[PDB]
A paper describes a structure:
Human [name] (hBest1) is a [name]+-activated Cl− channel essential for Cl− transport in retinal pigment epithelium (RPE). Although the structure of hBest1 is still unsolved, two Best1 homolog structures, one from bacteria [name] (KpBest) and the other from chicken (cBest1), have been previously reported. Overall, the channel is a pentameric assembly with a single ion-conducting pathway, which varies in diameter along its length and is constrained at two narrow points: a “neck” contributed by three residues (I62/I66/F70 in KpBest and I76/F80/F84 in hBest1/cBest1) on a transmembrane helix, and an “aperture” formed by a single residue (I180 in KpBest1, I205 in hBest1, and V205 in cBest1) on a cytosolic helix. Here, by electrophysiological and structural analyses, we show that the neck and aperture in hBest1 are both indispensable [name]+-dependent gates, and their dysregulated opening by rationally designed or patient-derived mutations causes [name]+-independent leak and elevates [name]+-dependent channel activity.
Alanine substitution mutants for each of the 12 residues were generated in KpBest and hBest1 and subjected to crystallography and patch clamp, respectively. Moreover, the equivalent KpBest mutants (W16A, [name], S19A, L259A, P262A, G264A, and D269A) all showed an overall similar structure to that of WT KpBest. The corresponding “[name]+-binding” sites in WT KpBest are occupied by Zn2+, an essential component in the crystallization buffer. Notably, the short extracellular domains of hBest1 represent a challenge for quantitative measurement of the surface expression by labeling techniques (e.g., biotin). They can be classified into three groups by different molecular mechanisms: (1) mutations on residues involved in [name]+ binding, including W24A, G26A, S27A, L294A, P297A, F298A, G299A, and D304A, likely cause defects of [name]+-dependent activation; (2) mutations at the neck/aperture, including I205A, I205T, 3A, and 4A, increase open probability by functionally mimicking a constant open state; and (3) mutations outside of the neck/aperture, including D203A, P233A, Y236A, Y236C, W287A, and W287F, alter open probability through the neck/aperture residues.
Residue numbers in the entry:
A (entry chain A): 21 to 289
B (entry chain E): 24 to 293
C (entry chain B): 22 to 291
D (entry chain C): 23 to 291
E (entry chain D): 22 to 289
Write the structure that this text describes.
């Protein structure tokens, strides 16, 4: 959403400032060779490399977690069918909580209003309990645990099979903490701070130190070099907001729709 | 690939004969800045190829679980219900149908022939109705295990032992689906394959000042190295890609089918 | 940061450089950059791996604290779901769990737990806990006795007792995981052979730079020492993630979250 | 092996100093800076490649380590749960030992028949040898032992399950070894790397010679040793079930296993 | 920590190199710094990756020992919460658990466990244990039948016997993992290749540096040699985590911590 074709052509210009500036240079006692900029440029590419690595890892973890939502809810619906196929009332109740959980987890991470979706899926008295909590999504898990918890007290599930389905609720519980953790723990600011400073300074001092060698090609190369360090420093911030609505963020709404369609395929609806 | 090895050799033959009208005008290309650019690109290609490898390893691992989980499920059926061969046959069908259906799912090819060969056509049209056929095959396998439980042939404990194996497959389905809907860079593997593509053709212009008539040779050696590394990343990054090698995906569904018929003594021929 | 002493100090070492330059010719000291390129790149490579190792320690520490919140959340869920009427047990257990995480934060910060312990538990138990040389483990054992009594009371079966037992196991893994990241630091050689060689590289770098950039030398030398020394000290910050630096973990915020969570509505559930 | 390519390189370096006579007379000139670029690139790729090979080696050693652990504790549970069934003890142990040797034979593409025959009845050997996967069949037979103890009421479903889990663990080891064996990366890793490390090594002296003159062969083999030795160790580590120097001592590993399992069931090697 | 002899050899190497620089032209030897950039950078990359593998072995060792303290703690917590009356079996099992960790320590350090073993066990069992070529495994087998006895004595259900069996399984994986780290060392070719090339690089380096640094090379080259050599030997001080240096795992401390923890959880 924020772009830097601004600094690629501030480069083209601060490259042109350089060529005309050349002949008043050694006058002052100012020369700039590339060798120390090779040193720094390489030290920055190493550090850009490790950083982007962290950024990609955390994006992959965000996708893994949403992946698990689809898996655990798929299999918990399957277990309900295979263990209690008479029980379509309980089927339909548990399914609306599991769908509610995903929608509510999307809203929570986008900081939007789950109320419409919650009301689409759940009794109004259930919606009230969920929204009264300071942790609505976690309160949805508690309610689904009640559905199977009473199926247990009613003897329709044993402690064994109660256990098989509880574990899926633990899986979702790990997804929720995981998303909360990812959403409140960015890659430390120092990294992107330090890097965005040095990648910036280096990208505009570069056409200076390149002028002695390349003279009047300083722009077509000091740009090429700068774009490379910038399309690589940008791929970073394009990968550390996984839950947003931007283009390269995760399509959470589409994944929530896939989760809902999946569970309704499994229950006829 | 080798079309861009020869776009290079001629970009360099261009570079030598045109080198004459170069600093007639003041247009200098050292090799020191192009070595800072190259080392940087080579560093990023290192990390990029490192992430592709990991996607490739995870796909191989997920397919490994299919073989593992299906084998231990069938071993459990035999060990716990050694008499129930009709159930053995039915379940072994769905497991085999799951593997093939998954492979067809990932490579976006038609599963109908493999399903029609494995399953009763009532279940085949049910499976082909679902927008999630592989999931529906797992669901059907589950009803088999559940019926043995309703019938009292499986206890809740032993029903549970087999349920776990179906979970393992559930994880494999989603893992594979996640690994396919991606990439995660979007079109930034777009930008880096052209950043390499540009560098590799600007390069002989920068080298000609140092090597004259030999720059077609040293700049194609370098280009091959960079484009080989890059293209290797392209291949690893899309492990179920249409432009992939189906040998192991095919070999894997064939191994598991073979193993399973063996385990249910449908081999050898009497 | 605390860098700005040395980033300053470097500009005056880079000054001593330029007011003893042409004085080089007389004294016999040639001093090129390409050896300091080599030395610089090796230090960058080694700083790259050091910093990677430190982030891993940060990330694992953050995950361990994530699990406290997860495991404690789902343990209260199980109690609310299996023994829904047992509010005296719910509140007793919730208090130990909140005791557990505050007690852990004090343990890793080497501060006194007694305030928080008393805010939350009976003082007979506040003294049982401080009596133990391992108080967080003692809190775990107490939470296990509540779980265990409910089982001798016949309110939990063996199955449902195990279900809750496993969550206390999960927290025993957080405890040991944190003790390992605390009591096992990174080896000390890694920390100060590496920080002497980076500043030593920083205070000599201009003496070899002064020949190529003349006056420009304090600029580029300080640019380069910034890049190097900010990277090194970020590494030493994340290496100690239970510490109190600006990039360490917010352990107090995280214990409040756990607390607000388990006591969501004075502890009221549907 | 590697010292033949080292030898061919010092010869290539002599061909270089000799034919330096006719260099610009034949219209050539080769600087070092281009080869430092190419050379650092190859170093970086070799560094990552090598890292991947070591990972495979550690995973292969890991999987074998789990055979020992799982088999140890399966025997531990038989003794703790059924202290009286010494015949089950000896039959399961002979399968668990049969499993290990067969796994070795499998991964080494050799014949298990001797070892099988040493350890089991011939009616079993024939059943095992009939299988597309003998190790699978051995796991299934070990599974019958504990499964028959369960039909006899000597094992509950719970305690049958506990031991079944260990057989499940051996299944995973088998799968993982089978996956580490039938999954070499596309030779692209070897062809791109091995031939370009070869090719770079042999043209390095032609580019070193203008700078170093008679010193060419000394520095040119030092650089060539470093790269080749690095590349060649990568190739040993990536096939860890082979018979090379750095390859898992699978026979000793099997004897340690048999030694262990015989030691736990009161017998003497 | 006799890197310092290697660096003083390096100062002599550049003394020799400055002294010898005259007869360079005469003898026809040309040494630029550029091919040594290439080689040194390559060595750095490989040293970086190698050192990284060494760190990862050290960390796996510490995690393995971390699991001992965790698994033994929660086994004892389970015994107290499930069988709070049976303090006779608590003490039996705790002494088997504490025996395991001391026996593991001595096993990895190739020392005599008899002192700690007889300090904790009746000789009725200590001689059984040391008659085995796998003592620590046998201590696990012995802890196992304590649990098994309780089960067959009806005091444990299959379910609760199961719950504790899983913790013995955890200790089994620690045993296997530690043994695996001890017997399977990091491939020795790593330290050969690298000790050679790093040492040879550090001595050949002044002969390439003096062309352009003249009387300064003793300094610049001892620096570089200090960086490489000390990085390389950090990797080696990390590759044997079960050793004896203060650099290594304080296994005695960890075993004392484990003993105190399990004794404290029982009163003693
Ligand atoms: Cl699942
Ligand atoms: Cl329904
Ligand atoms: Cl499995
Ligand atoms: Cl059959
Ligand atoms: Cl059969
Ligand atoms: Cl949990
Ligand atoms: Cl195990
Ligand atoms: Cl026996
Ligand atoms: Cl545990
Ligand atoms: Cl006691
Ligand atoms: Cl006690
Ligand atoms: Zn799952
Ligand atoms: Zn239904
Ligand atoms: Zn966004
Ligand atoms: Zn059958
Ligand atoms: Zn067959
Ligand atoms: Zn959990
Ligand atoms: Zn309550
Ligand atoms: Zn000058
Ligand atoms: Zn000057
Ligand atoms: Zn295990
Ligand atoms: Zn026996
Ligand atoms: Zn499994
Ligand atoms: Zn555990
Ligand atoms: Zn006691
Ligand atoms: Zn007594
Ligand atoms: Zn002795």
């Amino acid at each position: 959403l924020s772009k830097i074709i601004f600094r690629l052509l501030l480069n083209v210009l601060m490259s042109i400032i350089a060529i005309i500036s050349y002949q008043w240079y050694e006058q002052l006692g100012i020369h700039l060779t590339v060798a120390p900029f090779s040193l720094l440029g390489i030290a920055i590419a190493i550090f850009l490399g490790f950083r982007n690595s962290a950024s990609y890892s955390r994006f992959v973890e965000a996708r893994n977690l949403w992946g698990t939502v689809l898996i655990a809810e798929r299999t918990l619906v399957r277990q309900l069918r295979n263990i209690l196929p008479a029980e379509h009332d309980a089927h339909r109740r548990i399914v609306s909580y599991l769908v509610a959980f995903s929608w509510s987890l999307k809203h929570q991470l986008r900081k939007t209003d789950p109320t419409a979706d919650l009301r689409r899926l759940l009794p109004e008295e259930r919606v009230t309990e969920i929204l009264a909590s300071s942790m609505p999504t976690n309160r949805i898990l508690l309610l689904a645990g009640n559905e199977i918890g009473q199926l247990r007290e009613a003897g329709k599930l044993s402690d064994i099979t109660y256990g098989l389905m509880d574990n899926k609720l633990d899986e979702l519980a790990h997804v929720l903490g995981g998303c909360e953790r990812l959403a409140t723990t960015p890659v430390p600011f120092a990294y992107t701070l330090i890097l965005q400073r040095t990648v910036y300074l280096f990208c505009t001092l570069l056409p200076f130190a390149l002028v002695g060698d390349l003279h009047y090609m300083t722009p077509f190369v000091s740009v090429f070099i700068s774009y490379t360090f910038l399309s690589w420093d940008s791929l970073a911030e394009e990968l550390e907001d996984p839950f947003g609505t931007a283009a390269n963020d995760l399509p959470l709404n589409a994944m929530c729709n896939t989760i809902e369609r999946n569970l309704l395929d499994m229950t006829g609806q």
